[PDB]
A paper describes a structure:
Echovirus 3 (E3), a serotype of human enterovirus B (HEV-B), causes severe diseases in infants. The results of our cryo-EM studies revealed [name] bound to three different types of E3 particles, the mature full (F-) particle, the intermediate altered (A-) particle, and the procapsid empty (E-) particle, resulting in three different maps with 2.8-, 3.2-, and 3.2-Å resolutions, respectively. According to the structure of the complex, the [name] attaches itself to the viral surface along the edges of the pentameric building blocks of the virus and adjacent to the twofold axes, a binding location similar to that of our recently reported antibody MAb 5G3.
Although the A-particle exhibited a significantly expanded structure, with an approximately 4.5% larger particle size than the F-particle, the [name] contacted the A-particle at very similar locations to those observed for the F-particle. In contrast to the F-particle, no density for RNA was observed in the other two particles. The solved cryo-EM structures of the F-, A-, and E-particles of E3 bound with [name] revealed the structural features of the virus–antibody interface.
Author numbering:
A (entry chain L), F (entry chain L): 1 to 114
B (entry chain 3), I (entry chain 3): 64 to 238
C (entry chain 2), H (entry chain 2): 81 to 327
D (entry chain H): 2 to 118
E (entry chain 1): 56 to 292
G (entry chain 1): 116 to 233
Write the structure that this text describes.
């Protein structure tokens, strides 16, 4: 089993402030033959189906706004949003699809500060 | 109608669609139970042997094409597309070089005698035919053809435990 | 007149009396003890590799230009041959290519069937480089083009240069055959293993390329079949692979 | 942006078989179908993947020997069988589909399996 | 490569079959109720007919066994003690006199072999050889009786086998004694010629080959519809 | 592909009235060797993960209240609730797990009538 | 091989309308091989089947006997069988279908109008 | 003194000079042309079926009672033997059972190892019937019990009746061996194929049952190993299966 | 329980006490009537022959001691102490040199056939075992051991007059 740890707490910041988050993986997530990082940052609207933001940590998913930028190489994995929104309330995971099993992240609520 | 016997082969452009397919169980399958072989077998509770199939192409002498005949063993599943059928046991039949194709379905069974009144579906074997290519004709020939299928006995059979046929129903005496 | 061939006990094919072209004069054969640069004695699978693998038919039409298949990639998904390709590391095998057309006496045309060893191909943009997806599909023919291609990572497909940058009229130098519908209807080519090393990886190296090119276009009358079907059959000969057991 | 549906949420009973189906809108060659467990107490936990075009079925060690998986590629319906059903296994089962070897692109609709003993 | 000995003509056609069940009384009544008659033929029992009409010509000997069971009859003046019941079974060859009533003169004809049988013993049996003018019995005959191309169609006079007639020997003064006869028929030393396709339509007449049009087989869902299917499981993963 | 059709419309009835629904399958869903019906009735709370009610059409899932009873043999499949509730709002599917693929149902909203 | 002997003893039955003089009682004994038709009532058609050997026996003679050979598909009878009927590892446990021997059915041939004869 | 055996070229085992018990006097062998009730000639897999399959060790303790394995079910998940069980329909094979204990000279005890053919077992509730899950696990030993079982669908497990309803003291009638730690340390039993039909299904029929029962309990001193490990090894001999090819 | 079969041998200091003792009458004695030999003999009204006994010492490989096995003829009395047993027919069995001891009880009878249903107590013979010395063990071995006893037939037996066994009681038919 291979898991990954997200930030200790939620964002807990004001609306309209750029947020930076990191995902600490418990093992290497780079395949040296292909130089590919097998991890993605997810997003689940409460009550609906989840949906990720960026896969491979360097290729933003089509249809995703330019505010989300995923980075991080090797075990570490980060993400940045230059404009946090009050209508983007969800639970942020950093899921890995490297090898069995496909373990999720830790969770990150978008709380209220206003 | 007489259209029961004629297997239709359409021209046009059929990519890899299936021409026909059935299951190898004489005596019990709806296809075989009314032929000579099935109706002889129905009289006997136990039977076993190998079944011979002949395919004949009734079409214009100027028609050219290929078909793939695939046979799957008793314990397997019928092929779903052409590639799966190719990877199994298959024969490629060309209707330009040759007109009739013979295929002798063998008998591999755990015991030595099958039964007419047995519930052994998906354990009898399947035979399917696939469009390896299309049917190509010159200007003036018909674009569609027909395949005729013959089934009969091979050299080795055994039958045991004679019993009444199920095809006749009435027990009344005539007049 | 007609002859039947039964390879692998699962495949049946029919042919007529026609000329056969044996490669560069040599016949496919196993590896002797003379040539080797490895230790483990090759295992020799022949029960299921040596059987006819009929590829899908293609349609020859009036405005068609030609097709090519890359071997041995064309048999990647073909039964037990693909399993041996995946499971092993090194491999060696020769092939037997049968090409058959189905045209009446009222059609006309002329085909050239060649087997080009090491047919390296150029790109549409002379600065960029080709990718593995544009060179060949698994077992689907890649078509030539009448006009000039303009993609970024696509092989140049002008028919008269054959993608290799040479005149298409001089392709007869390689093992080849002519299928003239007026007289002939089929072609056979036996191709041995040609390389500078005794064994190589199946997924890395493209041993050769089979090209079918019409020089005389197809013509017919209104009340006739709009196409002519072409069927290609491959039967591997003398396949070898490395050994998986300790010395 | 392709939709995705399932059998639906039904109120079941303990030790009663509940098959959670899933519709499809794609082909069946070298792709993957799987599920998760949506429970706030237990977070998100996968249950098992199914691979069309590969003939591979696996289960988690937390449900190994308890749950089984089956599917019919032609029928476009995939089963996820379960045995010795408990009352705390209730979750909003999401059907995840992957058209790639390694990804998570399209998510399901949502189905509930809560029971009352 | 197992045995075929069970599919031979002898082992296929020499099975005894019940071909007639009748009853007759032993006392006053309508005369036709005091004896039992049967014309020997193979066209009334459909199960045996379907077996004999796989071949065009047949040649065999007949073995006939009679099972006779008698019981007392309710009414008035019941018999308190009756000694025993005896039955007379008569085989009439083609062209012999045929009784029109019980207690007739044809019952005492010297050309008709008869069996006298007492209650309690083993069932009576007889065997008739191949009795015909021609060299075979014919199940199917395409032609007429007269040469004028008119008459009864499909009837041949070369395959007559006679009649069987059974009655009570005893004369009963006290009460009635109903009896029941069962006939078991068996071919022996069978020889068959010119096989034919077995019948598809149901039988409609014992004398004719008339029929109703019937479908050549049982319907199917589709041309490429193999029988049913199997669900996903541990083997199928 | 094997699919199944649910009722043409939603329940659209009053609260507290027993509801009966049926699921019309396009093919046989009984395996004669095991006499098992491979179909289940599902339930998805809007915004959360789905969850079925009864599997095998004769074994109610543990923890499910006694109000739901699934029936139906062969191609047909029915379900009955003796007490419909306003807090059970969801989308009712009749999903089949007989063979590939595992196709869902058609959907059934619990609308408002009050 | 099986050897089966039947001992049959009949007596009159108390009641009204006793038989003053009865000729003799005849009994029918039928052995049904595995898979043959089995009567569901007296005076049925299965009693007259040509595949079922029968013995007709009259009172006063020696007891009737028959002998059945080793009638089975396998090569032996098995007293203990560890296994199932179907290959799904489910069904009736300990049952083998290779050791069926048939049935024996006995009835009265005579039809009696006066009284009963147990 | 010591002897090494190499079966399948992948398995190595070591034994000492000990007595071997050859079944009912006969030795496992292939099917001759004399006995058959089928047509297709059996295929004979021997490359991988004939190798040592070592099952997991078990712990013999002071209060243990005994164990049983059902064969051939015990090799359902064991490599290529399981694949042949799944892929084929009919089967026939004899076995060679090795049982080895590891106890010092300061321990004591006495074991009986038997091979019961057709060991049909009863149920705890005399009215109900057993199920397939309580008879045997895949390759895990099923334990006997000192006291009376009270389940519904569970095999009666009182040790002194052996689950078959017979006195446990009379089990010596079957092929058997005694492992007395004072003198012996291992046992070997060669079991042929015993049935009333030449072939049968592997998943339907339990050919036999292997039972290990201690008559003299294990005893030792405080500063000693609390258990004794028992290792069981199975190597199929003369396996056959039906044929999958047309005549 | 399973403790029926294990004959207990205690250590400590047993002066000359008796280990076990029984009477030689298979088929009727409570000890033998349920073994293979006794249950075969119970089917026959008359029987005769010689009975073979094997004793096996289940104990530590480091244990040493002696036992005295004494056999008395049909007409005698069982020995009361060790000295009387020694003066009769006896064998001294050492569990250090040897592990198993065989003893073939013979058949001397006035007639030629004994009976299962006979009242012939104290006329059948006795077998007893006595502590010739104690059981001596080093530090680390268990102080107590077990003896297992096997009984079976010798080469010569005769049986006559087959009859129903008394072990089955019910005459009811099952269902």
């Amino acid at each position: 089993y291979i898991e990954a740890s997200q930030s200790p707490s939620s964002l807990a910041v004001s609306v309209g402030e750029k947020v930076t988050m990191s995902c600490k993986s418990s093992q290497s997530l780079l395949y040296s033959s292909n130089q590919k990082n097998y991890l993605a940052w997810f997003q689940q609207k409460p009550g609906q189906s989840p949906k990720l933001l960026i896969y491979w940590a360097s290729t933003r998913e089509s249809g995703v706004p330019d505010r989300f930028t995923g980075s991080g190489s090797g075990t570490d994995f980060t993400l940045t949003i230059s404009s946090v929104k009050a209508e983007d309330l969800a639970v942020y995971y950093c899921q890995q699809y490297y090898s069995y099993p496909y373990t999720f992240g830790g969770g990150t609520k978008l709380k209220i500060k206003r | 109608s007489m259209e029961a016997y004629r297997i239709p082969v359409t021209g046009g452009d059929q990519l890899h669609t299936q021409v026909f397919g059935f299951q190898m169980q004489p005596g019990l399958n709806s296809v075989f139970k009314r032929t000579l072989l099935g109706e002889i077998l129905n009289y006997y509770a136990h039977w076993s042997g190998s079944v011979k199939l002949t395919f004949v192409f009734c079409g214009s002498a100027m028609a050219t094409g290929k078909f793939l005949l695939a046979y799957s063993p008793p314990g397997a599943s019928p092929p779903q597309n052409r590639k799966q059928a190719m990877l199994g046991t298959h024969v490629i039949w060309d209707v330009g070089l040759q007109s009739s194709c013979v295929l002798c379905i063998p008998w591999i069974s755990q015991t030595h005698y099958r039964l007419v009144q047995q519930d052994e579906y998906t354990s009898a074997g399947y035979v399917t035919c696939w469009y390896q290519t299309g049917l190509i004709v010159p200007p003036g020939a018909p674009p569609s053809c027909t395949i005729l299928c013959f089934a009969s006995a091979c050299n080795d059979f055994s039958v045991r435990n004679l019993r009444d046929t199920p095809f006749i129903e009435q027990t009344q005496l005539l007049q | 007149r007609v002859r039947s061939i039964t390879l692998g006990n699962s495949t049946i094919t029919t042919q007529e009396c026609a000329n056969v072209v044996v490669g560069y004069g040599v016949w496919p054969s196993y590896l002797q003890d003379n040539e080797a640069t490895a230790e483990d004695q090759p295992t020799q699978p022949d029960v299921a590799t040596c059987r006819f693998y009929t590829l899908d038919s293609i349609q020859w039409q009036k405005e068609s230009d030609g097709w090519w298949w890359k071997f041995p990639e064309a048999l990647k998904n073909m039964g037990l041959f693909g399993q041996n390709m995946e499971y092993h590391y090194l491999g060696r095998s020769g092939y037997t290519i049968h090409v058959q057309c189905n045209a009446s006496k009222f059609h006309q045309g002329c085909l050239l069937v060649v087997c080009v060893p090491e047919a390296e191909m150029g790109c549409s943009d002379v600065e960029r480089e080709v990718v593995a997806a544009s060179l060949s599909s698994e077992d689907t023919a890649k078509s030539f083009s009448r006009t000039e291609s303009n993609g970024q990572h696509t092989v140049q497909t002008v028919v008269y240069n054959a993608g290799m940058g040479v005149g298409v009229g001089n392709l007869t130098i390689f093992p080849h055959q002519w299928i003239n519908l007026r007289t002939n209807n089929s072609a056979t080519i036996v191709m041995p293993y040609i390389n500078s090393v005794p064994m190589d990886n199946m997924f890395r190296h493209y041993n050769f390329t089979l090209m079918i090119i019409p020089f005389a276009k197809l013509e017919y009358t209104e009340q006739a079949s709009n196409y002519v079907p072409i069927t290609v059959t491959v039967a591997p000969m003398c396949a070898e692979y490395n050994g998986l057991r300790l010395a | 942006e392709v939709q995705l549906q399932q059998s639906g949420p039904e109120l079941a009973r303990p030790w009663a078989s509940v098959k959670i189906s899933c519709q499809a809108f794609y082909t069946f060659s070298n792709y993957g179908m799987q599920w998760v467990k949506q429970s706030p107490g237990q977070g998100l936990e996968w249950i098992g993947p199914f691979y069309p075009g590969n003939a591979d079925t696996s289960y988690n060690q937390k449900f190994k020997g308890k749950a089984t998986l089956t599917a019919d590629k032609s029928s476009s319906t995939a089963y996820m069988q379960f045995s010795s059903l408990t009352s705390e296994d209730s979750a909003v089962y999401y059907c995840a589909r992957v058209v790639a070897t390694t990804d998570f692109d399209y998510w399901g609709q949502g189905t509930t399996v809560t029971v009352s003993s | 490569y197992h045995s075929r000995t069970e599919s031979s003509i002898e082992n296929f056609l020499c099975r005894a079959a019940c071909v007639y069940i009748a009853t007759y009384a032993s006392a006053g009544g309508t005369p036709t109720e005091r004896y039992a008659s049967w014309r020997i033929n193979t066209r009334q029992m459909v199960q045996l007919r379907r077996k004999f009409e796989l071949f065009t010509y047949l040649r065999f000997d007949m073995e006939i066994t009679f099972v006779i069971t008698s019981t007392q009859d309710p009414g008035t003046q019941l018999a308190q003690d009756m000694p025993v019941l005896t039955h007379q079974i008569m085989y009439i060859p083609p062209g012999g006199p045929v009784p029109n009533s019980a207690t007739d003169f044809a019952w005492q004809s010297s050309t008709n072999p008869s069996i006298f049988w007492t209650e309690g013993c083993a069932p009576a049996r007889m065997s008739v050889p191949f009795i015909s003018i021609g060299n075979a019995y014919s199940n199917f005959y395409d032609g007429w009786s007269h040469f004028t191309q008119e008459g009864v169609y499909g009837f041949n006079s070369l395959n007559n086998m006679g009649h069987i007639y059974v009655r009570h020997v005893n004369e009963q003064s006290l009460g009635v004694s109903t009896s029941t006869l069962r006939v078991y028929f068996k071919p022996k030393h069978v020889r068959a010629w010119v096989p034919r396709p077995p019948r598809l339509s149901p039988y409609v007449k014992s004398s004719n080959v008339n029929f109703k049009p019937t479908a050549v087989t049982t319907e199917r869902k589709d041309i490429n519809d193999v029988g049913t299917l199997r669900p996903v499981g541990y083997t199928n993963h």
